[PDB]
Symmetry: C5
Subunit: 235 residues, 5 copies
């Protein structure tokens, strides 16, 4: 348990858009609100350029959420700062809270492969899928009640399923034990959203998922380039 290495804190902030209200907001006002929010992301972009954090914005299909901001920042206080700056934008008046998830990129810190994984510049893939997950602690199938080695063996086949879908789906696992409601947040990024269905389903036929996986809601969405943001809020 002490073996996990810790990178960036990660907030997935999912919001819903109050389209009805947003439409009522005059055109020039709506335009400014987009500008304001764009300049905010422009700040985030500067942070990403300095390798001092990362974000992704995705519009989420379905009604669970409309848009996801995923922010990775070095400190949790930075995360809070971002959430709060977001919330105090005009646009955010129309971005109602939907679901949020705090977690920390988890896996020596100096090693480049670790460095990349711990401080990950989030992939600008067409699609993203997020779900929080737990390991079941339920009766016979109690992950925590397992042997270190049994756990290791369980995770061995899970590594294999992941590895099959590498070069298709990038997987960012964030640990959220004592940071949020589940134990891990799994974010996948693929240029093909079906690869998400493929990866997560194949994974379920691993003893680890089959037996121990308790998962939360799945959110999938499509990358919202910032050039596409004005368009998306056009009413």
């Amino acid at each position: 348990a002490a073996q996990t290495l810790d990178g960036w804190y990660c907030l997935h902030d999912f919001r819903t858009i109050d389209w009805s209200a947003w439409k009522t907001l005059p055109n020039e006002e709506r335009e400014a609100a987009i500008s304001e929010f764009l300049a905010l992301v422009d700040q985030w972009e500067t942070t990403e350029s300095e390798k001092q954090g990362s974000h992704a914005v995705y519009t989420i299909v379905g009604q669970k959420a409309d848009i996801l901001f995923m922010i990775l920042r070095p400190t949790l206080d930075e995360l809070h700062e971002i959430e709060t700056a977001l919330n105090k934008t005009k646009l955010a008046d129309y971005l109602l809270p939907a679901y949020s998830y705090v977690s920390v990129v988890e896996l020596p810190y100096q090693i480049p492969e670790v460095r990349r994984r711990l401080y990950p510049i989030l992939p600008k893939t067409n699609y993203i899928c997020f779900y929080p997950m737990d390991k079941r602690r339920q009766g016979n199938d109690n992950w925590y009640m397992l042997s270190m080695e049994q756990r290791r063996e369980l995770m061995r086949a899970h590594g294999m399923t992941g590895r099959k879908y590498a070069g298709k789906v990038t997987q960012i696992i964030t640990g959220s034990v004592g940071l949020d409601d589940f134990e891990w947040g799994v974010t996948l990024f693929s240029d093909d959203a079906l690869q998400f269905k493929k990866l997560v389903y194949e994974m379920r036929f691993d003893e680890v998922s089959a037996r121990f996986g308790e998962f939360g809601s799945f959110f999938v969405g499509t990358r919202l380039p910032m050039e596409n943001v004005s368009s998306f809020f056009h009413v």
Copy 2:
């Protein structure tokens, strides 16, 4: 798990109607909003005609939802586009979110029987029933923990129950592993809504349903022809 073939993405967008607000909206305005939404579906109809997707609109009985749009589009980005165009209609100001489900028509692609099932023109039946379902991964009854063959045998009797209610109920199963909260979305279409009760109950006495079925909410509704849409929103 790799054997499943993948057709159209499917969004079931269930909304509730805010009748009270809708009534307050002036008559000519309400009329325009219907026109606007009708022209939207007219777009969808064109897509269906080009065999480039499919939709169904059903009004849902009960309070879980008032109306369901079920859209099947080739890409998930198309789905999102539709949801977002819907949401940015006047009418949608009054169609509050109720429940949504994303999933992919799942069952080589070239073969007509597959082609029809993968890219299904949704049946214009009097009634529809939707429920998302899982296979239980709970203790002894852990579907995922099952043998491939045991699974196959389980599904054998389920095929038989389905087949009894073929020519009554059309069944569109969409897999939603890593696309939404459950694993499958089951949509049934029948000209008789009782046949839904008949099919789903008989199915529950199959070991597969009995033992492994974890189901979500059931929604049933009646086809809303577009000629019937102006009528339905008449206040």
Copy 3:
């Protein structure tokens, strides 16, 4: 499973009253809204007189709901029509959705017995109690996993407990498999509400309830005569 006989579809539409709003609505307007809703029920009453359906209105004690309309109509499309006509009344602007349940009176059809049970004129008893119920499909206690005969034997004692409380409580069971979220909707009607506590508690000490009963929310209420409707909405 194919042995069940099917009567009327049944909607239990529970609403809450927005008293605060209702009070703000001017007196003459409120009066008209009552008149309008009364004339609606007058329609329903005509349907009941023609033996072409049935309804009951009860005010529900507690905060789960304020009023229940229970409508039994031959077709589900009729049900929808009623819900939608209700919703498009003035009064319904103040009758917020609370909970709803669709189901079909279930128990050859030609026999005058069975006819009565399938097409039941709902009893004008002082009180009503509704709860949706399932049979547990959980581990060892999996009703569906049971023998037909074991089921029969289980239901034998349940019949006996029911029968003790016949001539006190009328029981309308509606099956809702593939019509709603649970498998049965149980509606009881008694002139004494305690008889509900008596019946449902005694039932729980039957193996069938004890072992297999998974129940939903219980709603109990008092019959709202239509002569009492103007009074009840007096503010």
Copy 4:
């Protein structure tokens, strides 16, 4: 199961206060609304004096609710009447629904010790705690599946734990099988709120609680004398 004796119906009506709205309401209007609600309770007080029912008002700590009205009335129709008169007060416009629980004081009727317990004048103790509870019907630990005698023995030690905390905590158990969502509503009244923690925790180490207790939300609050009501709503 038929051995339980039945006293007053009991409604616990928990509300939340919409302070923000309440503040906006002019002073003289707020004053009248307090007066109106006070005169309502004055009615309830008259009922209590005639031994024809009982109430308690407590302000509830925490955000689950702000205030609880607990009303015990002979008939359920009386309960409804009270709820509805409450709801149609000005003050109630600001007392949003939070949670409610209907149940019947349960424990021959003529005997004074029964009479007192069945028709209980609720104790004017500094604090109250309410929680609804069930007996587990889950697998091995299925209360209902138990022997009458085993149940009796289970309840024997529970009686002992209760009895230790008698003269500290008054316990009003109301049965709510087929009246609400759980099977019992437990209301405790003590002049010391810690005695609630003491009683309910010690109880959990009884096989009955340990094994069979499924409990709902706990609400604790402080007695709101009616002389303290004007003060409490002062803004």
Copy 5:
């Protein structure tokens, strides 16, 4: 069970900020509301100085809540008084309810180490994490069904894991049996939020957590100094 010693009642009042509304509130009005709330905390600060209670304000990351007031007061009536004074501030019009938890600092009273633990001046650490927890009473893993000694042994290793993370994370456990929905509220305070992930994860690999831990939502946040309050509400 009688061995636990009881200190201050503790309310964790988590609120969400209605930023949109707050922005609409004029500047001078918003300024006054901050002043008003600051003067309130100034009252709390005086209480803390007199050692007659304690508070902490933290802004919570994520959408579960925006801000947490944690108040420890000697009596529950004091707690209520505080909640109600908070709620009747201008600022609180914009601090919507999010989640609340009442509980009592639990661990002879005269002894300083007990005194400190029972009447704890909450640590002014950069971060806080709160989660309510239960001990599982589920089947085989029924804590309550355990031997006193087995429990003691279980808690022995839990003490060891805690002790490793002492001098990093301060842990305030509050018992809430019969005060709220779970049995314990765990509040951690660390200058490093990762130490929370570290402590709670390592704890899960203790039989006690692994087997018996049923936990609620986790909230983590950052200390909001009162000099930082004006800033935080700046719009």
